[PDB]
């Protein structure tokens with residue numbers, strides 16, 4: 001069975017960089033399909049952020065393409081999201097998920113992460 | 128950029144009866160339409176892919192039809208944990224876009 | 235050039251049809267099997283292939299039922315990997331028809347095929 005465990009700062013100050021890590025176990029990132037990042041806004045509107053293939057190719061949503069950076073680390077088997085210069089807009093619960101691809105049926109996200117809630121608050125938090 | 132419209136928006140029902148949600152896209156998508164289930168606890172699962180194909184584990188009471196630009200998601204009975212928010216995406220071209228959402232409540 | 239009517243094949247059943255004197259395996263896979271197939275790490279395969287590299291529609295597994303070791307025809311729904319077992323020298327294939335154990339060096343070959351509604355055309 002495949003498992004996706006998410007971790008990272010659940011609260012960042014505006015103008016800073018949000019960083020989330022998605023640890024995968026039971027299947028290697030380099031082995032095959034697509035590794036995506038998506039966010040769920042409080043107003044219930046899912047948005048596809050982007051992905052990184054098993055080869056290492058990136059594909060970002062044009063809406064955020066100039067800010068984010070989805071990298072990986074084959075050794076530890078985990079991919080990351082890095083959304084630069086955040087704003088109150090970026091306040092959402094982020095999900096990492098795997099999507100398969102069959103030439104006929106197309107893409108489909110079959111394995112989802114737990115979901116990491118991030119808040120762009122100006123508040124102070126113990127690191 | 129294509130955009131879907133999940134209607135009805137957050138409609139409730141009883142403790143065991145059929146319900147039909149829909150998803151209409153701005154442009155034309157072949158049949159590349161998936162359906163997700165967001166549990167109240169935040170757990171999101173895949174239910175249907177390619178407008179009608181069932182995923183592993185999803186009960187037989189889940190259907191899926193439509194084509195062109197109009198789609199569906201029928202259920203047999205909400206008995207008992209069918210209560211969650213349902214979404215729908217397309218994938219004929221990047222970027223992928225989801226629907227507005229459709230919460231399912233029990234009166 | 236053989237035509238097979240997919241609409242005739244039930245849920246989790248195997249159908250064998252002749253094509254150029256060689257047996258062609260066709261299985262209408264169940265949702266659970268499809269997941270089982272696409273959830274295997276390449277590190278556990280002597281002939282590394284994703285289920286997607288092998289099938290066009292995840293519902294239809296279409297391959298030549300010729301064991302890659304010495305040519306026997308593998309037995310359906312047998313083996314230690316929920317797929318096919320070759321009685322000749324003990325080669326086990328998974329639900330994607332990949333070689334998992336035994337002397338066979340390769341996964342069951344996939345012939346050229348195209349879909350046309352309820353029927354597929356192997357050849």
Ligand code: FES
Nearest residue numbers: 301303304320323
């Ligand atoms: S021919 Fe199948 S194992 Fe030898």
